[PDB]
């Protein structure tokens, strides 16, 4: 999906947030972002170690 790839791509570069980057990447794609989908992904992201979740593969 759009959201998933966008935050993952940023994570590789090493940094992310609502307006500054998530909104910027999807907008660079040329797509209009749904705020609710960004908010949900960010709220889920808080207090999570993205690198650890990757280390098991599923």
């Amino acid at each position: 999906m759009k959201y998933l790839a966008a935050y993952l791509l940023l994570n590789a570069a090493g940094n992310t947030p609502d307006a500054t980057k998530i909104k910027a990447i999807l907008e660079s794609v040329g797509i209009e972002i749904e705020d609710e989908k960004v908010s949900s992904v960010l709220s889920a992201l808080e207090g999570k170690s993205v690198d650890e979740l990757i280390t098991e593969g599923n």
């Binding site: 590789a12 910027a24 990447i25 794609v29």
Partner: protein, 58 residues
């Protein structure tokens, strides 16, 4: 990889995976453009079913 994540978001958004489209998402991320890496990426992705590759994998 930022380049792999950029490709999956571009396909999810419905936009073609070419040098311009990867470059705009890459710039929005803030990562510097490198001509060799995205050219290479388009070339690997040429002649591909993105959908069929995406699902199997060990």
């Amino acid at each position: 990889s930022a380049l792999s994540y950029a490709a999956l978001i571009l396909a999810d958004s419905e936009i073609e995976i070419s040098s311009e489209k990867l470059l705009t998402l890459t710039n929005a991320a803030n990562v510097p453009d490198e001509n060799i890496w995205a050219d290479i990426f388009a070339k690997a992705l040429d002649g591909q079913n993105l959908k069929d590759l995406l699902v199997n994998f060990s």
